Amino acid sequence: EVETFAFQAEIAQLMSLIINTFYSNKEIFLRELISNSSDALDKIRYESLTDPSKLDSGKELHINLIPNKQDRTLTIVDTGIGMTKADLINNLGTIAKSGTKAFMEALQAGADISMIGQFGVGFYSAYLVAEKVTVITKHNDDEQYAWESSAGGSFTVRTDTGEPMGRGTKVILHLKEDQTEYLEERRIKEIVKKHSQFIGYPITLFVEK
Ligand SMILES: CCN1C(=O)CSC1=S
């Protein structure tokens, strides 16, 4: 059972802008996703202070970066609070609507794409480098879901039958054919050092075989 949904018009417009605009400083996508993971980690950590049983699905709070040249994917894994089915279909898009409006206004007034995270919609910068994004997520209060979109106005959600994650989010970037530099260890190290050096959680960059 795979459900297909339309993005709101404003969100679709934003992802077309990201895909079609000429903008060479694509590497900021990593900083935005790592920032999202850190936010999700902060949330489950704060919740656990008043309800320790929220860490029963995994006490480790961390971020893993996993390149795979064979599949041509870069995966950003966190053990943060995760997302419910309602988040995937409703809540994230509701919030993103006003952040997109503000970002798009700032752009025509002289801002640039690197400022996207100041507007709360840094996730869609993934389409600077990815032709398709698959998101696996598990929240304590819901089932494990796979979200997916190749842009083009629509996204899918299904119950995920793969390996159980426990709790957290896995963002799988299926990289565009000319963006495989973001599979290289030295390139990923450089970007993390430059843009994410003070994240308050361990970032482990896996190496490939
Ligand atoms: C975690 C992945 N993601 C967002 O951050 C906004 S929509 C979506 S799926």
From Swiss-Prot:
Main location: nucleus
Modified how: ISGylated.
N6-acetyllysine modified-residue sites: 43, 69
Keywords: Acetylation, ATP-binding, Cell membrane, Chaperone, Cytoplasm, Host-virus interaction, Hydrolase, Membrane, Mitochondrion, Nucleotide-binding, Nucleus, Phosphoprotein, S-nitrosylation, Stress response, Ubl conjugation
Family assignment from sequence similarity: Belongs to the heat shock protein 90 family.
Function: Molecular chaperone that promotes the maturation, structural maintenance and proper regulation of specific target proteins involved for instance in cell cycle control and signal transduction. Undergoes a functional cycle that is linked to its ATPase activity which is essential for its chaperone activity. This cycle probably induces conformational changes in the client proteins, thereby causing their activation. Interacts dynamically with various co-chaperones that modulate its substrate recognition, ATPase cycle and chaperone function. (Microbial infection) Seems to interfere with N.meningitidis NadA-mediated invasion of human cells. Decreasing HSP90 levels increases adhesion and entry of E.coli expressing NadA into human Chang cells; increasing its levels leads to decreased adhesion and invasion.
Protein known as: Heat shock protein HSP 90-alpha
Parent-protein start and end of this portion: 16 to 224 of 732
